[PDB]
Design a protein around this ligand. Structure first.
Ligand code: 9HW
Ligand code: DQW
Ligand code: CL
Length: 109
């Protein structure tokens, strides 16, 4: 991994760590639309994303730069903001995790 991608990997590890689990947990695995009963999810969200998918892409060296990584993490939050009402509990969690993400991403070497 490039130096910037190492920073990205560090951010990813932090997002998945116990420190943030109280608000990060919904983002750990792909949304299971059937399990959650959200039968319109895949009509509304054309490009699902979640932290396990970002992790697999990082491990496989799929991301060629920090910008590509950040686009995926941001897509994950955007999908949450698109599907859910802005006052929803999961949206509040998304905002908190995105704050953690954006502030550390801003510290890119
Ligand atoms: C109809 C209620 N809304 C949902 O079920 C959405 C689809 C779902 N909510 C939730 C969700 C709803 C309430 C709370 Cl407190 C936390 C997460 C959710 C739950 C999950 O459990 C494994 C996984 C993903 C989500 N999730 C994410 C991420 N983005 N939207 C959601
Ligand atoms: C609340 C917005 O959806 C995300 O804001 C991120 C900022 C770093 O708090
Ligand atoms: Cl972006």
């Amino acid at each position: 991994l490039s130096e910037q991608l190492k920073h990205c990997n560090g951010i990813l590890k932090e997002l998945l760590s116990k420190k943030h689990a109280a608000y990060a947990w919904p983002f750990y695995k792909p949304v299971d639309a059937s399990a959650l009963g959200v039968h319109d999810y895949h009509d509304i969200i054309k490009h699902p994303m979640d932290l396990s998918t970002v992790k697999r892409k990082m491990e496989n060296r799929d991301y060629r730069d920090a910008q590509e990584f950040a686009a995926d993490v941001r897509l994950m939050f955007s999908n949450c903001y698109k599907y859910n009402p802005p006052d929803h509990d999961v949206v509040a969690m998304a905002r908190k995790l995105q704050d953690v993400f954006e502030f550390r991403y801003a510290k890119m070497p």
